[PDB]
C-alpha cells in the first residue's frame, strides 16, 4: 500500500539489533509512524533471517500490547517496516524516573500489560527472546507494548533445541546460562521478572559482566540451586560442582518497596525450575493484579 515518497523523516530514533528506526510522518494523512529501515544484502546473503522472522511473526500477532506493524514497503535495496509510533522506550523512561521512581500503580499497570502481550505471544507459539526495557515501548496514554521481534521465533510443541545465543545478558534465564538443551516460554517470563524488579528498585536486578558473573549474581540473590529446588540442575551441561553455595536472600531485601503479593509474584517469575516458573497466563490471575488500574505516565 505504501511507497516512500509520502513519508517525511522527522528524526532518527537510532540503531538497534538490526535496521534503523526513524520517526516519520505521512504527508498526506498526517499520521506519525515509526519506520524501521532494513538493508538487504542484495549482494549477497539476501533478506536477513531476523527480518524474515520479525515480519512473519508480527503480522500474525495482533494485540494492543504488541507493537502494530502497519505496512511493509519493498524495494530491491531496502525494506521499510511501518509501525505505529510510540514515543518512548521503557529504558529511557526508567532513566527519566530515576530521581522520583516509577509509581507502584504504573509499575503494576505496565507489568500487567506486558504479561497480556506475552501470553498472547506464547498462545500463538512465539518466543520473544529479547525482553528488556529498551524493547518495550510506551505511549502518552499509559500503554506499553512489546517490540523488536528480530530475535523471536515460532516454537513447536514440544520444543526442540533452539539458538543458544539468546537474550541480553542481564535478562537471561539460568537455564540458558547453564547451556540447557531445551528452553521455552519460561525464558521470557524470567526476563519480565527482571524487568519488574528493575522498575521497583530503579537498577538492574542482575547486572552481570560475563556469563559466569551473571550466574553468580543470580545465585547470590536467589541462592545456589540444588536438585531439591530444581530437579535436573546438576545434569545441565554448564553446571559445575565447584559453584559456590550461597544462601537465598530474604525477598524484603531483594525488593524492599514491594507488598507481600508483589514479592509472591516476583518469586514465581524467578523460580529456577522452568517447569514451575509461572506462565504469563497464570500471572495475570495473580492477586497482585486484583486492583490493577491504568495510570497515565
Amino acid at each position: 500500500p505504501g511507497s516512500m515518497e509520502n513519508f517525511q523523516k522527522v528524526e532518527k530514533i537510532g540503531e538497534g539489533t538490526y535496521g534503523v528506526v526513524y520517526k516519520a510522518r505521512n504527508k498526506l494523512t498526517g499520521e506519525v509512524v515509526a519506520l524501521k529501515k532494513i538493508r538487504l544484502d542484495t549482494e549477497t546473503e539476501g533478506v536477513p533471517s531476523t527480518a524474515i522472522r520479525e515480519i512473519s511473526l508480527l503480522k500474525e500477532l495482533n494485540h494492543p500490547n504488541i507493537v502494530k506493524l502497519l505496512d511493509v514497503i519493498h524495494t530491491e535495496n531496502k525494506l521499510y517496516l511501518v509501525f505505529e509510533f510510540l514515543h518512548q522506550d521503557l529504558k529511557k523512561f526508567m532513566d527519566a524516573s530515576a530521581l522520583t521512581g516509577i509509581p507502584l500503580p504504573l509499575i503494576k499497570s505496565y507489568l500487567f500489560q506486558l504479561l497480556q502481550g506475552l501470553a498472547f505471544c506464547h498462545s500463538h507459539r512465539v518466543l520473544h527472546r529479547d525482553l528488556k526495557p529498551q524493547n518495550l515501548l510506551i505511549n502518552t496514554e499509559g500503554a506499553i507494548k512489546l517490540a523488536d521481534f528480530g530475535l523471536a521465533r515460532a516454537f513447536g510443541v514440544p520444543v526442540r533445541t533452539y539458538t543458544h545465543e539468546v537474550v541480553t545478558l542481564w535478562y537471561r534465564a539460568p537455564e540458558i546460562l547453564l547451556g540447557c538443551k531445551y528452553y521455552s516460554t519460561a525464558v521470557d517470563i524470567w526476563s519480565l521478572g527482571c524487568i519488574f524488579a528493575e522498575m521497583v528498585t530503579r537498577r538492574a536486578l542482575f547486572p552481570g559482566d560475563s556469563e559466569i558473573d551473571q550466574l553468580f549474581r543470580i545465585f547470590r540473590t536467589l541462592g545456589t540451586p540444588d536438585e531439591v529446588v530444581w530437579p535436573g540442575v546438576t545434569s545441565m551441561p554448564d553446571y559445575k560442582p565447584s559453584f559456590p553455595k550461597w544462601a537465598r536472600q530474604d525477598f524484603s531485601k531483594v525488593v524492599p518497596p514491594l507488598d507481600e503479593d508483589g514479592r509472591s509474584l516476583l518469586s514465581q517469575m524467578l523460580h529456577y525450575d522452568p517447569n514451575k516458573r509461572i506462565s504469563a497466563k497464570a500471572a495475570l490471575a495473580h492477586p497482585f493484579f486484583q486492583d490493577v488500574t491504568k495510570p497515565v505516565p
Binding site: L40, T42, E43, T44, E45, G46, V47, P48, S49, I52, R53, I55, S56, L57, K59, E60, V72, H74, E76, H122, S123, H124, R125, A154, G156, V157, P158, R160, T161, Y162, T163, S184, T185, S279, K281, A282
Partner: protein, 255 residues
C-alpha cells in the same frame, strides 16, 4: 505444559489460511504433479545433505505450493522456486541455515537469481511464513502414545513425508488430518494399537473422519517401493530413523 491447547487451536485456524489451492496444477501450463514430485524428492536429498530439520522440508513445500497457486512457472524455473523456498524455510527454521552459496552450489542458476527469487517468493507469500505443517501436528500427537515408541514416531514422520511428494491426492488434506492418518497408520503398523481416545478429545477427529486420508496413505505406503521417487525411503533406512522404511506395511486395517 499449558498453552498446548491454545496453540493447537490456533494452528487449526492457521492451517486453513495457509492452504494452497487444491486444483492449482491444472492451471499451470508447463508444470505437472510429476515435476513437482521430482522437485520435492530433490529437496528431501538437500535436507539430508545439509542435515536440515524435517520441519524445514515441510515449510519449504508449503511455500512452493502457495507460490505455484498464484504464479505461473516454466519448468526450467521450477527448481529456482524450490531453491529459494528451501532457503527461506532454512532462514525461518534453522539455527544455522546454509549460506546462499551452498544453495547455489546444489543447483544451474546464478546466485543473483536465487537471491532475486527469494525476494519474489517473499512478496508473493506476503511474508506469511509461519505456516503449520504435518510435522508440527505430529509432534503434538506424539505426546499421547502410551507408552512412547521410537519406531512409531519415525514411521509417522516417514509417512507424513511421503505425503509431501504427491500433490494428487495429498493437497486436498489439511496438515492436521494427514498427521492424524500418519500417526494412526504408524501406531497400528508397529504396535497393533489405534488412534488414541485422548487425541479424539483434542482434535475432534475419529478413525471415521480420518478414513479417506488413511485409505490414500495406506495405498501410498504399500506402493512406496515402486514410486518413481525414492529419496524418502532411502533417508528412512538410516538408523537415525530406526530403519522404519524397511518395515512391512499392513495389508488391511479392519476399520
Amino acid at each position: 505444559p499449558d498453552y498446548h491447547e491454545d496453540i493447537h487451536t490456533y494452528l487449526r485456524e492457521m492451517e486453513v489460511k495457509c492452504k494452497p489451492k487444491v486444483g492449482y496444477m491444472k492451471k499451470q501450463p508447463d508444470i505437472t504433479n510429476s515435476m513437482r514430485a521430482i522437485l520435492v524428492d530433490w529437496l528431501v536429498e538437500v535436507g539430508e545433505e545439509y542435515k536440515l530439520q524435517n520441519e524445514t522440508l515441510h515449510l519449504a513445500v508449503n511455500y512452493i505450493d502457495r507460490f505455484l497457486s498464484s504464479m505461473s512457472v516454466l519448468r526450467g524455473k521450477l527448481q529456482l522456486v524450490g531453491t529459494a523456498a528451501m532457503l527461506l524455510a532454512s532462514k525461518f527454521e534453522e539455527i544455522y541455515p546454509p549460506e546462499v552459496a551452498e544453495f547455489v552450489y546444489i543447483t544451474t542458476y546464478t546466485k543473483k537469481q536465487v537471491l532475486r527469487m527469494e525476494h519474489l517468493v517473499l512478496k508473493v507469500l506476503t511474508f506469511d511464513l509461519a505456516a503449520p505443517t504435518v510435522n508440527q501436528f505430529l509432534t503434538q500427537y506424539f505426546l499421547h502414545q502410551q507408552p512412547a515408541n521410537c519406531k512409531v514416531e519415525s514411521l509417522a514422520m516417514f509417512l507424513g513425508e511421503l505425503s509431501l511428494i504427491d500433490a494428487d491426492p495429498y493437497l486436498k488434506y489439511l496438515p492436521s488430518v494427514i498427521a492424524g492418518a500418519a500417526f494412526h497408520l504408524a501406531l497400528y503398523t508397529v504396535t497393533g494399537q489405534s488412534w488414541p481416545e485422548s487425541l479424539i478429545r483434542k482434535t475432534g477427529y475419529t478413525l471415521e473422519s480420518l478414513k479417506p486420508c488413511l485409505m490414500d496413505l495406506h495405498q501410498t505406503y504399500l506402493k512406496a517401493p515402486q514410486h518413481a521417487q525414492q529419496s524418502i525411503r532411502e533417508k528412512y533406512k538410516n538408523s537415525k530413523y530406526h530403519g522404519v522404511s524397511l518395515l512391512n506395511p499392513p495389508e488391511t486395517l479392519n476399520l
